[PDB]
Amino acid sequence: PRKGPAPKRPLVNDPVYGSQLVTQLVNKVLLEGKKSLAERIVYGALEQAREKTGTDPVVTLKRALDNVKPALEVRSRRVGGATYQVPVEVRPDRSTTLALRWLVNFSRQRREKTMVERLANEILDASNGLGASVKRREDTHKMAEANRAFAHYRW
Amino acid sequence: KNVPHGAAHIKSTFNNTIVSITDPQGNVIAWASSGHVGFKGSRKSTPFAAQLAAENAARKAQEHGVKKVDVFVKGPGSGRETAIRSLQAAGLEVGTISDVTPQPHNGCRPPKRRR
Amino acid sequence: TRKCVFCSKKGQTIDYKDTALLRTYISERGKIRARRVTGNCVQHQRDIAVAVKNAREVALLPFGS
Amino acid sequence: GSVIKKRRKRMSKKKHRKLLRRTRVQRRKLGK
RNA sequence: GGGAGACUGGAAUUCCUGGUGUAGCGGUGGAAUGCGCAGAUAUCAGGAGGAACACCGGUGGCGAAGGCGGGUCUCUGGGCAGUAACUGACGCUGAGGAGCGAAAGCGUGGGGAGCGAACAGGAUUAGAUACCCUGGUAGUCCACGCCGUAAACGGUGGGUACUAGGUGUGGGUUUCCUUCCUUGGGAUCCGUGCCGUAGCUAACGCAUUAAGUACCCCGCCUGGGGAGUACGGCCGCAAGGCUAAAACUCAAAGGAAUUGACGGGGGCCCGCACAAGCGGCGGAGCAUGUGGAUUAAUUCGAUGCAACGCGAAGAACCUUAC
């Protein structure tokens, strides 16, 4: 990656829903190398959302991630052995990536002792805006806006 | 006391930062220092310490009832802009910023340079 | 490169009393402007600097406001 | 040139001046 | 900004007096001596004193060199150009001699803010009579005299004539376009830089500001040390300066440039080097190898990266060398 940016990977269209957000989520939640189990977990969570909200999964997940999609990030730059925190805006792709990473990483903390209901509950909470992903988003924007001063390096 | 319009003096050197809020006649009503906020040694030369000192001094000035403040800044800056932003974020209104640094006309002898 | 406005025929004489002509050549802080910026010759630049110093010493221009 | 030459000269001069300082009172006593 | 004398201006540092104000300030790679809580730092007002003169301000001006810039006044030295009226070779150099001569240093009497040899602490370190930090006397400053040295360097004595040019810049006279202002262009005299032929040089380099081509005069050199030392002499209050050897010892000491190597010297470009993400080690138990102690040996090798689930891809006897 020293010379130039590597070409971006293509995304296979999701066969059941047609939008790649769900396949991105199932690829991220995948671990130990198993597509079927992760697929069934995500599908169970989505169908629990179906039976609990009564709306279409695609649009509800869309505005949930939009409401948990971050806008700015903080980056470290070191001079003379001392670090500086600079705010940089984020491309939407990495914004959605980080939001989904937060969701998946923190979906192992709900205390209802099953992963599929964990995902359904956190997806619904983010849909309602009371989820912890909203909390991390607000914390990130607080960090970005509070330390907006240190940006004269222009990066 | 009730002074609705005062002045701010920020002294930013390479080893410390001192913030003083004064009356328009110069009487000091509140002051905070980079080592007064729990920083000892070189740690009190950083911009973060300057921000905390500015916030603390601004708080103390606010309980005396000050609204608008003018800024005179002095010294080789490390925490100048940080202190200005910390004063702004504490609710005070920064009217004017002027750099008053004593610049001799070639009198006296500087100490010998280090090696 | 510009020309010395005093080397011209209509160049006004340099007087230490004349606050406007001297203030043309002092910066916003009161310091005298360099010869490269103004574009006058060595002789007239020396006259300008001496006149500005004279004006400063009699409280007609500030000592570096 | 080379600074080795000035180095030799300076060392000789330094040693001689040190010797002169070491025998000041004796030299004044003898010369007088 | 060539020199001398007198008067005088502002910024800033320190100290003193007085308000406000509280617990820190100072310093460093990090600290600690140190200064404060008996009122420091910080912020205002008043006062005392000394030294150096921001901006103009540069490879720009002046001086024989050493050197010279806050302002004004008084006294005073040199240089350049134009005219060419005047004297009519009165010129050049100069052994010895005389004068001037940075800084440090010396004598007498003042002055003393800042800085700061010496001297005290603190820190680093194996030790630190140092580098770094906190204090700090002589001195730096003024008047009058001494000393007479510097990498006092262009490491290049002074005078004169000649040998292609290009291009910056400081001072002065004139011609042609003239808009008649402007580096309008040219011509010429005197300085100060860069580049460049011919020529010179061991090379680097110099090159009309010669280290080229020639004439006049002075100073100086004869292998490296011993040694710019001893002895004698002159000068100085002193420190010391000037003139200046021999015995002995080495077979070299030097100058410039070439190729490698090296640097606690740089600049670009790469690698899962960083950043970005996934999963771990460091916590628990077990299995090997290793460092450590033992007895009879606990067989030997292996020691950052590049030794340590490595030799040894299989130790009850054999393997085993104990």
UniProtKB/Swiss-Prot annotation, chain A:
Gene3D superfamilies associated with the record: Ribosomal protein S7 domain (1.10.455.10)
GO cellular component, one term: small ribosomal subunit
UniProt entry keywords in alphabetical sequence: Ribonucleoprotein, Ribosomal protein, RNA-binding, rRNA-binding, tRNA-binding
Single GO molecular function: tRNA binding
Pfam family, one: Ribosomal_S7
PROSITE patterns: RIBOSOMAL_S7 (PS00052)
SUPFAM superfamilies found in the cross-reference section: Ribosomal protein S7
Keyword Metal-binding (UniProt): no
Entry-linked InterPro entries: Ribosomal_uS7, Ribosomal_uS7_bac/org-type, Ribosomal_uS7_CS, Ribosomal_uS7_dom, Ribosomal_uS7_dom_sf
CDD domains named among the record's database cross-references: uS7_Bacteria
Record keyword Ribosomal protein present: yes
Domain of life: Bacteria
GO biological process: translation
Oligomeric and partner information: Part of the 30S ribosomal subunit. Contacts proteins S9 and S11.
Protein function: One of the primary rRNA binding proteins, it binds directly to 16S rRNA where it nucleates assembly of the head domain of the 30S subunit. Is located at the subunit interface close to the decoding center, probably blocks exit of the E-site tRNA.
Recorded family membership: Belongs to the universal ribosomal protein uS7 family.
Protein's UniProt name: Small ribosomal subunit protein uS7
Organism: Mycolicibacterium smegmatis (strain ATCC 700084 / mc(2)155)
Classification of source organism: Bacteria, Bacillati, Actinomycetota, Actinomycetes, Mycobacteriales
Swiss-Prot record, chain B:
Any GO molecular function: structural constituent of ribosome
Record keyword Hydrolase present: no
Keyword terms: Ribonucleoprotein, Ribosomal protein, RNA-binding, rRNA-binding
Keyword flag RNA-binding: yes
An individual GO BP term: translation
Highest taxon of the lineage: Bacteria
GO annotations of cellular component type: ribonucleoprotein complex; ribosome
Region (Disordered): 97-115
Protein family according to the UniProt entry: Belongs to the universal ribosomal protein uS11 family.
Assembly behavior: Part of the 30S ribosomal subunit. Interacts with proteins S7 and S18. Binds to IF-3.
Function of the molecule: Located on the platform of the 30S subunit, it bridges several disparate RNA helices of the 16S rRNA. Forms part of the Shine-Dalgarno cleft in the 70S ribosome.
Entry protein name: Small ribosomal subunit protein uS11
Species whose genome carries this gene: Mycolicibacterium smegmatis (strain ATCC 700084 / mc(2)155)
Entire protein: shown range: 23 to 137 of 138
From Swiss-Prot, chain C:
Keyword Ribonucleoprotein among UniProt keywords: yes
GO process terms (BP): translation
Keyword Chloroplast: no
Gene Ontology cellular-component annotations: cytosolic small ribosomal subunit
Molecular-function GO terms, alphabetical: small ribosomal subunit rRNA binding; structural constituent of ribosome
UniProt KW keywords: Ribonucleoprotein, Ribosomal protein, RNA-binding, rRNA-binding
Domain of life, source organism: Bacteria
Function, as annotated: Binds as a heterodimer with protein bS6 to the central domain of the 16S rRNA, where it helps stabilize the platform of the 30S subunit.
Subunit structure: Part of the 30S ribosomal subunit. Forms a tight heterodimer with protein bS6.
Similarity remark: Belongs to the bacterial ribosomal protein bS18 family.
Protein name, as recorded: Small ribosomal subunit protein bS18B
Organism name: Mycolicibacterium smegmatis (strain ATCC 700084 / mc(2)155)
Stretch of the intact protein here: 17 to 81 of 84
